[PDB]
Amino acid sequence: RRRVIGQRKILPDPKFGSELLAKFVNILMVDGKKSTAESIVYSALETLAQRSGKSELEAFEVALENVRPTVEVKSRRVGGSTYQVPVEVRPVRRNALAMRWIVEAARKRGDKSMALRLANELSDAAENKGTAVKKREDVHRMAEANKAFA
Amino acid sequence: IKVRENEPFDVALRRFKRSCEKAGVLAEVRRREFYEKPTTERKRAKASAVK
Amino acid sequence: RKQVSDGVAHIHASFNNTIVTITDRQGNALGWATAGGSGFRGSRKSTPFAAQVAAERCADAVKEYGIKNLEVMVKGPGPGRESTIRALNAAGFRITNITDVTPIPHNGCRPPKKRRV
RNA sequence: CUUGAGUCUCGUAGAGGGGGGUAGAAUUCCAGGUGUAGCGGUGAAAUGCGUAGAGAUCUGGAGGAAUACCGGUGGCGAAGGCGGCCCCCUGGACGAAGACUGACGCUCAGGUGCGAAAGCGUGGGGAGCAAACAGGAUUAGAUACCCUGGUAGUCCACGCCGUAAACGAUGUCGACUUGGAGGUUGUGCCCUUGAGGCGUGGCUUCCGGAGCUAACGCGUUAAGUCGACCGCCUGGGGAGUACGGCCGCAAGGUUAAAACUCAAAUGAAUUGACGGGGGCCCGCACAAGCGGUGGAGCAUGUGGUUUAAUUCGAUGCAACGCGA
Ligand SMILES: [Mg+2]
Ligand SMILES: [Mg+2]
Ligand SMILES: [Mg+2]
Ligand SMILES: [Mg+2]
Ligand SMILES: [Mg+2]
Ligand SMILES: [Mg+2]
Ligand SMILES: [Mg+2]
Ligand SMILES: [Mg+2]
Ligand SMILES: [Mg+2]
């Protein structure tokens, strides 16, 4: 409201070393079972290996690049009407937005295990396809189509 | 209103005569005349045209 | 086609819409751009960021004649009175005499009342 | 007799008035070229206007009304009210010296004249705006607010009506009572030796002193202190209505009650409250996230219903696994 904060970081990657990566393990983590999150966010790259090849490190971020937006809109009421003024999202929440929408679809795959339900979307990005990547450009639709605002 | 000024560029300067017309002299009109409403406000703004 | 190189382009900025008509040198249409027919309208149109797209849209519908240096004529307080111009100084078009015509009667007519929202 | 009031001389400013011409900007319309799938409008829309070519853009023409900037707490007028420019006829005001008149003045029931806007009669006029009216839209309804159109009227000449929050809501004339800053318009004067420095008048804003006032406030342009004359008030509703008289083409105006009914109606100001008033500032209030309820089955309370009883209390949040 009238106060300001910084950020709530935590223990990074268990070994591959990657602070932000933790989010992918947290954001996805449910019922506070991080002990299992590491069992999914890690085993995931162990499967994309043969899938992609090059360091799973890049593999992630690689396709991830085709999932992170860069411009959204925020409802702002004025004189009764509430415009949808656009706004370019900084990297901080950008990368986050992706992970959210990414892990989501993965849990909507509706197949069997998540380990695979996760890799699919992790690669579906680069090759382009899936619900996750969908939102990416889907957001672009609302974007600019309202450029008449901001 | 007129504009020529050479020298390659495109800064602005569209503010020259601007402060002597614009949507101001226009907004001044367009809608029904004031008739009596001016003699009041145009002479009520003076109340502030002092302090 | 005819090749003028030296033409004009008046800007009609109305509070609700705006149209960019690139005329020749003696006052002859050559292509008109309209904010309304820009794939968007209503509350989306009118705005500068939008109503301007029409102006610069003239190029791929006017330059077919071939023009370089030119002046500009603005007439209308519409929300694009200026925005529209920039598109011209970025679409490749040169620039020359930029004068505002926008009419102003010396107190003759009588505008309508209304506006009781 | 002259200080009141008035005439003469010379000048001073001004939208004072009546008449007659004239100018430029803009809208509308009509015409022609260019050019093409939209314009216009709104919160959005729709009606409306577009391919029979609008809109825009340019060229020519017609017409009516109004006079941007100047322009202002500016000015003039009894008030109403009066703005481009020029001419003609014409009213008042003001300053300068004296000259002349010699109380010839103040006020005024009745009487007479002027009267915003709308409206009325006759004949003209008609671009823009717009009662009425017709569509479109909003709404539960919307005979409205909004949009698209649009007749009277708004304009002119003559005649009529005489009303307005005709307001400073403050009758006119005269005499006095601290001052401060500004406006505007005459005139005397200072190296004029500057724009300016000092006087003295006419009108004019803002402030405020004593005083006045119920208070708000007024305060040398008084609501202060005095005088001359006139107009009017006497509880609220009934009612500025009825009846009559007078005036008017009419619409209506003017004069103006009673019955009955109430204990008030009312003015200024104080405290709080509230506002689809303003400024400012907080709380998982929202915004940013995660996970839920209403879905399903069951548990528990409740309302209802039922019963011989379904013991009683708890009810917006602040009752409903609450007293239990
Ligand atoms: Mg209307
Ligand atoms: Mg006067
Ligand atoms: Mg009249
Ligand atoms: Mg008549
Ligand atoms: Mg005072
Ligand atoms: Mg009161
Ligand atoms: Mg808290
Ligand atoms: Mg929320
Ligand atoms: Mg939900």
UniProtKB/Swiss-Prot annotation, chain A:
Q: One GO term of the cellular component aspect?
A: ribosome
Query: Which keywords describe this protein according to UniProt?
Result: Ribonucleoprotein, Ribosomal protein, RNA-binding, rRNA-binding, tRNA-binding
* Molecular function in Gene Ontology: mRNA binding; rRNA binding; structural constituent of ribosome; tRNA binding
The UniProt entry's sequence similarity note says: Belongs to the universal ribosomal protein uS7 family.
What's the stated role of this polypeptide? Answer: One of the primary rRNA binding proteins, it binds directly to 16S rRNA where it nucleates assembly of the head domain of the 30S subunit. Is located at the subunit interface close to the decoding center, where it has been shown to contact mRNA. Has been shown to contact tRNA in both the P and E sites; it probably blocks exit of the E site tRNA.
- Assembly state and interactors? Part of the 30S ribosomal subunit. Contacts proteins S9 and S11. Cross-links to IF3 and the P and E site tRNAs.
The record makes one more remark, namely: The strain K12 sequence is shown.
Q: What is this protein called?
A: Small ribosomal subunit protein uS7
* Species of origin: Escherichia coli (strain K12)
Q: What would be the name of the gene that encodes this protein?
A: rpsG
| First-to-last residue of the parent protein present | 3 to 152 of 179
Swiss-Prot record, chain B:
**Keyword annotations for this protein?**
Ribonucleoprotein, Ribosomal protein, RNA-binding, rRNA-binding
- What's a BP term from Gene Ontology annotated to this protein? ribosomal small subunit assembly
Write out the biased-composition intervals (Basic residues). Answer: 43-51
GO CC annotations on file = cytoplasm; cytosol; cytosolic small ribosomal subunit
Q: Cite the GO molecular-function annotations of the record.
A: rRNA binding; structural constituent of ribosome
Question: What is the protein's known function?
Answer: Probbly involved in recognition of ribosome rescue factor SmrB in stalled/collided disomes; fusion of protein fragments to its N-terminus decreases ribosome rescue in the presence of SmrB.
Q: Which family does it belong to?
A: Belongs to the bacterial ribosomal protein bS21 family.
Subunit: Part of the 30S ribosomal subunit. In stalled ribosomes contacts ribosome rescue factor SmrB.
Name of the molecule in the record: Small ribosomal subunit protein bS21
Species assigned in the record? Escherichia coli (strain K12)
Please indicate which part of the intact protein appears here, giving the first and last residue numbers and the full length: 4 to 54 of 71
From Swiss-Prot, chain C:
For this UniProt record, give its keywords in alphabetical order, as a comma-separated list. Methylation, Ribonucleoprotein, Ribosomal protein, RNA-binding, rRNA-binding
GO biological process: any one? Answer: cytoplasmic translation
Quick check: keyword RNA-binding in the entry? yes
Q: Which residues form the signal peptide?
A: none
- State the function annotated in the UniProt record: Located on the platform of the 30S subunit, it bridges several disparate RNA helices of the 16S rRNA. Forms part of the Shine-Dalgarno cleft in the 70S ribosome.
Q: Which HAMAP family match?
A: Ribosomal_uS11
Q: What protein am I looking at?
A: Small ribosomal subunit protein uS11
Q: What lineage is this protein's organism placed in?
A: Bacteria, Pseudomonadati, Pseudomonadota, Gammaproteobacteria, Enterobacterales
